Amino acid sequence: GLFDIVKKVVGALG
């Protein structure tokens, strides 16, 4: 998968 990493990057954007 990859989305678990993408949600962590979006989490930094608030």
**Six-digit token string for 7:** 């949600």
Contacts of residues 6-14 at CB distance under 8 Å and 24 or more positions apart, as own/partner, are: none
> Tokens at residue 4, please?
């678990």
Per the entry, the structure determination technique was: NMR
CA–CA distance, 8 with 1 (Å, rounded to integer)? 13
Backbone φ, ψ for residue 13 (5° rounding): -80, 5
| Residue 10 to residue 13: CA distance in whole angstroms | 5
H/E stretch holding 13 reads: none
